[PDB]
């Protein structure tokens, strides 16, 4: 898959996760963006996490849609840096 397409896909996941967490869980846009990266990278500090059933369901969807996409994106980035 072309590297630029993978870039767009991961950006779309990032927008999806950030907007979702902001609207469902009520955290700031910046915190929501940070939480999205921490989650799709599988870091999961737990300083932020969903506290509502809708947020829990949403988080499971982000996990499924985002972890693979992020993994493919970082490996493609590797190639351009290295």
Nearer to K ion, 26 or 44 (CB): 44
6: Cβ contacts below 8 Å, ≥ 6 apart = 69, 72, 73, 76
CB of 73 to K ion, least distance (A): 14
* Position 78 contacts a second copy (CB under 8 A): yes
Distances (CA, A) of 30 to 22, 24, 25, 47, 63: 9, 15, 13, 14, 19
Q: Which residues bind a second copy (CB under 8 A)?
A: 1, 9, 30-31, 33-34, 37-39, 41-47, 49-50, 53, 56-57, 59-60, 63-65, 67-69, 72, 74-75, 77-78, 81-82
């Amino acid at each position: 898959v072309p590297a630029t397409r993978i870039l767009l896909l991961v950006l779309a996941v990032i927008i999806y996760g950030t907007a979702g967490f902001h609207f469902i869980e009520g955290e700031s846009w910046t915190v929501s963006l940070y939480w999205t990266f921490v989650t799709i990278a599988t870091v999961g500090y737990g300083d932020y996490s969903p506290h509502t059933p809708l947020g829990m369901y949403f988080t499971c969807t982000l996990i499924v849609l985002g972890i693979g996409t992020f993994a493919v994106a970082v490996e493609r980035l590797l190639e351009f840096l290295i």
